[PDB]
Symmetry: D3
């Protein structure tokens, strides 16, 4: 339906708030980010494929495309604000009322248990670490917490199959 | 303290979300909006003064300067998102923890009972309405809803002393 | 590999040129556009699914994700410029030199024969038509031509299953 | 009156020209700046309050709100340009013709003699210094001059009560 | 000298203020404008050549390039502000102290007597009118006044040779 | 003709793509760049004049104004993309079909043989180098390659007369 699409297209206009709070001049939109997660999810899926780890690619890509979809209505409430706002409670609600067809993908994603759910989570973090890397090259000097994003990925089983990649990333540091 | 000032200066960086969601190019920041509320509050207290309506101007101006201060942390969570997000609960928390010295000003502003409180509330809406007016001249054609804030103002006792001004405003549409 | 991902991420920075030439302020990025294509592809896929038309969703989503990938190097050369530049020849080249793993998806996409290929093409054109619609609500009045993409969609067999939707779209103008 | 307010709101749209000349991407508007001045003035007034220095806060806040009001018409003519244009003479004129009701506040502010006038001047400069600080964190490296405004503040009697604070500020450099 | 060139390049960063005041969000820079004046000057000069009117093209092109050069220091102070600021006085000063080598071109330009001086003045106005045209297509609806510059052009002798063109321009409204 | 002028005015809207790819936030337009080339060409012409090297200044200035004119149609296709696109072939075509009157100024410029051709080429690069310099002051740290344009300049005979200037430029790095 046209009304749903027009709604999700608001993501092209919504900024990724963390960057603004860090003084990043023209930050990427939530949609730019979502594209990045989707692409990294695709690329990583192939790597996992040829390393013996089988992944339900379809589910993965759908999960990457829809993972931040609730923000089309509640916006990318930054982590710094989440000490005062329950963004999680809000997301579930929106998915249950506005995006019921995607609530299963959302629910599984939050659980971060399945191979697909962990992949998207890793793609989410990599797009960010690497986006931070870019903004650093642009001159921003307060993109400080990366050893804890890298470390957050390391805490996921699925990372075991990607250690060499995550090593190249931390090497950009 | 410098830390606090640096924190509130974030307002210059955070956009007024309602405009973004409506597709407005280069929307004003929260600080831009706050200045306007501060000015209109000044001007309107002036008018109330010479019409026999007693106003604690000092408290009013303070209230106007601090009214959206919590957003320095939680951002300008749009109305469209407040169906899933309790923004007011979040604001009270930030004020209680991060701006305890302004909690009472905030608390009185939320109650919208006292003359000062309703004045700032009226200034807040007028800035917005007049801002929607300006963006329409820029070419945006979906800010229509914003003009029903005139009716919200009319439901406040204090507006009884400003009727004339509210109608000039409505005539701008 | 990190080098590939960083490259594709350039898409978040490159603008969709047609909008600039038409004078739109702050035009979407190629990545914004791609995300949209990917979402519409998802949504339409499931519409086709429960209408008897079988779609290899995995291939479709992958196809939508990488359809404009060559632009990460070529940039979104506008249609007005393609009378002097062979964007098609340049794309193919990028894809078999830089993106050989995606050359098949690209090649099938260009042929616009398979159900998936036509679906992505339709997603591509709808995102744009709907994007033009949004910019018009912003005030831009010379995006008229963009609406004749509805006819371009009608010329594809797969649209046969979407007539009701296409009607709602054209109804927006 | 609506016309006046609409005029003052022009400040949301005008840049603070010093940043532009120095190459800063998206510089704050004059209204962004004013709000900061108003806030710092509020904060500093409380500090002065509990340190034995009585301040007429109401006048101080009005003064901060109105201090750059003439730029709504003349724009924030940069210091580098003032060697060829008498901004001061321009400001007074705009204030007597267009803002006669704020001329006294402006006149006192320019004299920088009274406690309130020096407070607002101190707020004006702290906002700027802190703003320069923020832009340096974004990568701009030619804002060094802006830091010698600490010395300009030291030359004001009122600073005597704020030694500790301006120490912390110069410490940020 | 490098210092001079770096100074004039500031024109790439400074906005043409009239547009900002009128609410046009991403206004051209003074350098954008100057390039247009230079191009129109070139184009018209050729038309004038084929029409019997001989022009000192070299002088005209230099005059077009240098005409707003003083703004590199004084900024494009808007017409609405020139009721309170003598922009002309300031311009001559800059040219005398900073651009002595270009003072003659400036002086002759302001006199608007010679064929070259009038040509640049016409070019200056045409770029502006055509620029207002483009911003109206973008949705701005308060640039009406800018069209009365066609009349200002008619008052110049040289226009006599360009009637047909001025008609095509006025026809765009 | 009004159609031609409007076309070339597109240059004000089109970004210089190299900067974008490098992460520069607000890049200069092609028009901004052309103005700078036009100014530097003027300034250097005078220098050459008083050093015994005679230059057809009229041709030089015309050549600097239209040197990147084809980009009004094909855009500023970056150097990084030219391994896949033949920008040169594309430019010549546009000039032959759309700018026939400026074709020989274009062809001479490309040959980089005549004093005027080499002067514009040197202005072209100097503007870029100095533009790179400015962006580095803004915080961008990956513009290093752009400084090897000094060596490209040295390869042109005409530079023999400018050694001292080139030394001041390289001195800025
Ligand atoms: Ni995400
Ligand atoms: Ni508010
Ligand atoms: Ni596409
Ligand atoms: Ni100020
Ligand atoms: Ni001009
Ligand atoms: Ni060039």
């Amino acid at each position: 339906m046209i009304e749903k699409i027009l709604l999700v297209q608001t993501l092209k206009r919504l900024p990724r708030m963390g960057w603004l709070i860090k003084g990043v001049q023209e930050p990427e939109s939530i949609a730019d980010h979502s594209f990045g997660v989707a692409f990294i999810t695709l690329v990583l899926a192939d790597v996992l494929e040829k390393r013996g780890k089988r992944i339900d690619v379809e589910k993965a890509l759908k999960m990457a495309i829809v993972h931040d979809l609730a923000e089309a209505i509640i916006t990318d409430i930054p982590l710094s604000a989440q000490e005062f706002v329950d963004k999680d409670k809000a997301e579930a609600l929106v998915f249950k009322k506005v995006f019921p067809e995607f609530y299963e993908l959302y629910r599984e994603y939050q659980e971060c248990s399945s191979p697909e759910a962990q992949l998207v989570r890793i793609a989410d973090k990599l797009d960010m670490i690497l986006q931070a890397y870019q903004y650093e090259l642009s001159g921003n000097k307060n993109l400080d917490e990366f050893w804890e994003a890298i470390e957050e990925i390391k805490r996921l089983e699925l990372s075991k199959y990607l250690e060499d990649i995550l090593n190249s990333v931390g090497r950009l540091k």
